[PDB]
Design a protein around this ligand. Structure first.
Ligand SMILES: CC(C)CCC[C@@H](C)[C@H]1CC[C@H]2[C@@H]3CC=C4C[C@@H](O)CC[C@]4(C)[C@H]3CC[C@]12C
Ligand SMILES: CC(C)CCC[C@@H](C)[C@H]1CC[C@H]2[C@@H]3CC=C4C[C@@H](O)CC[C@]4(C)[C@H]3CC[C@]12C
Ligand SMILES: CCCCCCCC/C=C\CCCCCCCC(=O)OC[C@H](O)CO
Ligand SMILES: CCCCCCCC/C=C\CCCCCCCC(=O)OC[C@H](O)CO
Ligand SMILES: CCCCCCCC/C=C\CCCCCCCC(=O)OC[C@H](O)CO
Ligand SMILES: CN(C)CCc1c[nH]c2cccc(O)c12
Ligand SMILES: [Mg+2]
Length: 363
């Protein structure tokens, strides 16, 4: 006679904290994006879908996790719900990883570029891929309980599902997330670097023009400025082309005062396009924490679920089984942390959460 409610209640209280931090956290992220105009951007659109994935984890997967801790890991529900529960748990965690891959990729491509719908295609695509990858679990598990039960404990026993699922559903977008992140940071380092190349060579020619005697030195300098005006792309190129014909007739003192009028347009277009990459670099790092903390907090669960399969004979399967029941809750907590990052590291989400708690919904 199994399925017995126990005194495993030290652990079972802590689990209710992680459930309510997940559900309320991620509801605020869904509420913020829907109601805040400042958040209506593609990355924020993914970060909602992630928070929907986290909330569905909190409503459906995480309570049943807690339920089995209350029954000493003997599965207390109907046996055909085990594979269902294993499916949603892997669904949501596969939808989170392929999202983080989709953000890191999309932005790199956006950093090599000059819609709600273009964003909402891409989310559905990732969910479609995630549902498709996670599909063997019910298809084969509901047919054979050997894959989803180990001694009345509902867990994914199938060692091939655990291996090939780990390297298809996880390592293929982890690789692509860390590469597209690293190049995105190298893209935005080069572009800050090119901007101060073109700060110094416009500032260099404004020294050259206001020293010049002849139409030669003004013309060469202005020609070089227009070259390194084209190197930053509109607004100011025609204004140099204004002042380029003044040098060409020989109207020198007249062209030198025109170039002083270019000087306000420059410092306008520099500090505005240089607060631009200052911002993307801030955000790319906040995504990088969301990325990093996903990986780190699941890493203990993820290595140990593979040592369960590598050292099947060599290692104590009781303590391995004993560790995973901890190491899954470290990765579950991750569902609560995405919203705290956005509180700490974005003013926009923070002011939004701040109003929603005071029940005040007009921006
Ligand atoms: C397996 C079952 C329980 C899945 C349930 C999915 C639920 C939680 C999903 C599916 C469709 C989703 C909605 C689809 C689109 C939008 C519009 C968007 O601007 C705000 C979120 C909102 C309103 C979503 C809220 C969450 C939602 C209702
Ligand atoms: C990563 C950490 C958290 C994981 C990766 C590999 C894991 C080890 C793999 C195998 C064994 C042998 C077993 O008999 C006891 C647990 C022990 C020693 C595990 C402890 C936790 C561990 C070190
Ligand atoms: C944080 C939550 C940590 C959950 C630990 C659960 C655990 O390992 O509990 C073992 C015990 O045998 C349960 O029946
Ligand atoms: C944006 C969110 C998208 C979310 C997408 C979710 C997709 C769920 C579909 C597949 C599960 C297939 C399961 C098939 C039904 C099994 C039911 C079952 O086994 O029932 C047991 C019974 O209750 C014992 O008594
Ligand atoms: C297509 C083939 C997809 C193969 C999917 C195997 C099942 C799966 O996704 O397993 C996840 C794994 O358990 C994570 O550790
Ligand atoms: C993310 N997913 C692969 C977790 C599977 C799981 C749910 N509940 C468990 C209990 C014990 C050992 C497990 O692998 C599990
Ligand atoms: Mg210089």
């Amino acid at each position: 006679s199994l399925l017995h409610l126990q005194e495993k209640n030290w652990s079972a209280l802590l689990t209710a904290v992680v459930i309510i931090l997940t559900i309320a956290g991620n509801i605020l992220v869904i509420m913020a994006v829907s109601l805040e105009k400042k958040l209506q951007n593609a990355t924020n659109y993914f970060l909602m879908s992630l928070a929907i994935a986290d909330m569905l984890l909190g409503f459906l997967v995480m309570p049943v996790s807690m339920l089995t801790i209350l029954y000493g890991y003997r599965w207390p529900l109907p046996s055909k719900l085990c594979a269902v529960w294993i499916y949603l748990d892997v669904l949501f965690s596969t939808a989170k990883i392929w999202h983080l891959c989709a953000i890191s990729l999309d932005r790199y491509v956006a950093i090599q570029n000059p819609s709600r719908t273009k964003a909402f295609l891409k989310i559905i695509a990732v969910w479609t891929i995630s549902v498709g990858i996670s599909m063997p679990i019910p298809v084969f598990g509901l047919q054979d309980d050997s894959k989803v039960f180990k001694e009345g404990s509902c867990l994914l026993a199938d060692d091939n599902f655990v291996l090939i699922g780990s390297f298809v559903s996880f390592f293929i977008p982890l690789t692509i997330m860390v590469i597209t992140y690293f190049l995105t940071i190298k893209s935005l380092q080069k572009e800050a670097a090119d901007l101060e190349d073109n700060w110094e060579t416009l500032n260099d020619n404004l020294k050259v023009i206001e020293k010049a005697d002849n139409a030669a030195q003004v013309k060469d300098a202005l020609t070089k400025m227009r070259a390194a005006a084209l190197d930053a792309g509109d607004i100011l190129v025609g204004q140099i082309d204004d002042a380029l014909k003044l040098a060409n007739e020989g109207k020198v003192k007249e062209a030198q005062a025109a170039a002083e009028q270019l000087k306000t347009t420059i410092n306008a277009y520099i500090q505005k396009y240089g607060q631009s990459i200052s911002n993307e670099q801030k955000a790319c790092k906040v995504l990088g924490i969301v990325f990093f903390l996903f990986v780190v907090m699941w890493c203990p669960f993820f290595i140990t679920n593979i040592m369960a399969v590598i050292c099947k004979e060599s290692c104590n399967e009781d303590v391995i089984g004993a560790l995973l029941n901890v190491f899954v809750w470290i990765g579950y907590l991750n569902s609560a942390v995405n919203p705290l990052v956005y509180t700490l590291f974005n003013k926009t989400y923070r002011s939004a959460f701040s109003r929603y708690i005071q029940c005040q919904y007009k921006e």
